[PDB]
Amino acid sequence: YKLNVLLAEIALIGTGNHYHEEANCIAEWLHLKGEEEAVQLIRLSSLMNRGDYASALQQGNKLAYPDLEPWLALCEYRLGLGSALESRLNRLARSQDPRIQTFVNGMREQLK
């Protein structure tokens, strides 16, 4: 493993196992090194694993990352913001990224 990748994966393990401050200390390092998208993924994961979807959503909509859009859609889904979710799915359906298309297709199925 490249060290920073290892640290990022461990931080994610941290956010899914109730070790949020440890994960944040790792993110503070990743932030210093410019891996801002990974920092945002760790923050979203930490907030969402704690059930704080509203805070996650507010922070996610204040920092733009195409690959993290699905996480914000998951926040809207869990909060039951139907209108916002539908709007987000229509926008994501416009993406050329096959991974985003797969996500949208999966969420549409989930919603049926």
Binding site: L6, I13, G16, L41, Y77, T102, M107, E109
Partner: protein, 38 residues
């Protein structure tokens, strides 16, 4: 991915009540973000 991280991903379906298609796409986006590290 580290086994313990995959273990967490394997619980996303029940934790967030989402199907396997959603989980797989999110796991792929996550992996993609980590693959951008120099």
């Amino acid at each position: 991915l580290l086994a313990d991280l995959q273990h967490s991903i394997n619980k996303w379906s029940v934790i967030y009540n989402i199907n396997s298609t959603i989980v797989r796409s999110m796991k792929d986006l996550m992996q993609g973000i980590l693959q951008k590290f120099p």
